[PDB]
Symmetry: C2
Subunit: 283 residues, 2 copies
């Protein structure tokens, strides 16, 4: 209860910090190497970011970085980058060709407020900007760590990650997947960005391999829990809840929170915020 308040409050704090930097990064002034920023496309990008939700992904980057003693400013920049990518994915998924949504969080979707062309280009531009934000000199982070993050984000986001998962998800609508197929498409469509968010803290902090693996694994448990909790919420069609039942799902959620917590045991009290996130997500 007090711990759940701890998470909710930090989620809102980190959301506000990330949003402030995002507003700055989406300002109308051309940067070095940019010719001009067309105002309509930029407004569409801002709209896409406005509709992006509660900023869990930046939260996880920021808090992974804090756990491991990395540079909070680098954490904020990488969180913003990751959020831009998350938001691009929603702008494209909302399109008529994909999920065909007129509304997102009570507001018109980007293609409805603008048009489909502008939505396509806004998502394309937000995906592109994510990489700019990570690699830019105003992200105070060594080049080797920037390169590692670019690789990690691209792998998590692309053919073998998020985008591939979306392809598998759409294919699942016409041809029902089996359990192994569901686990795979979920790990890609939603798990990979959450994995990346946590692993990124270790990359940013310059952690050893063991610690980077630990945070990756933690991120995998967060994503597994995120997916189950969401499918349970909707319940109360290729879903593990559908195949295995609600009782199985609720026990597996409980298990994943316990596993997540055990992974961060070695950090003691300093892991409380991330452990609270696991519990919030899972319930």
């Amino acid at each position: 209860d007090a711990q759940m308040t701890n998470f909710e409050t930090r989620l809102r704090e980190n959301a506000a910090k990330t949003e402030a930097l995002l507003g700055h990064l989406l300002s109308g002034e051309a940067r070095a190497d940019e010719i001009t920023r067309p105002q309509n496309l930029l407004e569409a990008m801002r709209h896409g970011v406005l509709n992006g939700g509660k900023r869990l992904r930046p939260f996880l980057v920021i808090e992974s970085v804090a756990l491991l003693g990395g540079d909070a400013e680098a954490g904020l920049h990488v969180g913003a980058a990751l959020e831009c990518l998350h938001c691009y994915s929603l702008v494209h998924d909302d399109l008529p060709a994909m999920d065909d949504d007129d509304l997102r969080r009570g507001q018109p979707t980007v293609h409805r407020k603008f048009d489909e062309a502008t939505a396509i280009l806004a998502g394309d531009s937000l995906l592109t900007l994510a990489f700019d934000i990570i690699a830019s000199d105003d992200n105070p982070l060594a080049a080797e760590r920037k390169a590692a993050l670019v690789i990690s984000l691209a792998r998590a986001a692309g053919i073998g990650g998020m985008a591939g998962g979306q392809a598998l998800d759409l294919a699942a609508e016409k041809k029902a997947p089996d359990e192994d197929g569901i686990i795979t498409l979920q790990a890609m469509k939603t798990g990979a960005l959450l994995r990346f968010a946590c692993e990124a803290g270790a990359i940013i902090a310059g952690s050893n391999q063991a610690e980077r693996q630990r945070l990756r694994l933690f991120g995998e448990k967060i994503g597994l829990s995120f997916q189950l909790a969401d499918d349970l919420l909707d319940l109360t069609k290729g879903t593990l809840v559908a195949l295995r039942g609600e009782a199985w799902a609720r026990e597996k959620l409980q298990e994943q929170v316990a596993e997540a917590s055990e992974l961060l045991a070695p950090y003691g009290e300093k892991a409380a915020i991330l452990i609270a996130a696991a519990r919030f997500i899972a319930e």
Copy 2:
């Protein structure tokens, strides 16, 4: 004539080298940090790359790198990355919401051979992969140079570059631009990737600022010539050919080739291939 053969032959050689690496990079095997590569989406990506054209952009990267004595393997990887990005842009531009093309180079467009969702995701995945290819450890290039390239490519490709130019171009269809507007949207829509292709050689080679600027400027002249030559070809609506006339355009093309050639004068015979490219493009 013999010089134009020199260019045409090297264009084909570099196209074949770049295509071989692209085929490898688009293989079905999951890489480290990828879960699996869905076969249908991967086929769509390959189709998008197959339809991409004559590989001028990789040619320029490879030859800029050669001019400045950089690592040809790094040149090949960065050229492949740039080509993936170029090809993504075509996959999205062909969509019904944008240019609405059923054919590209005599073949069905990606959304026609597959569907619109798959085309959207294929372009998204090719854009994402471009950044993976640049930053990956199998690109033999120092991290600092990789970061610089990620920034340069993202700036050239995004809101202040290619994507922004496409937005300005679509807006031009409903509201005619003036000359300054045309120059700007052209510099973004087509010039920026050609600028990047040439400047990239200097970044890869670890050139001093002066030399990097020189290759950037050369790339700007290539792009200016590329645009004019193309608009002239079509002639024989917001175009400089339309506003200034064919005679003005043909003289300006000639001027830009001369300027391009003068920029590379200090490299002597070693600049012959790039100078031939300027002449091929312009005529």
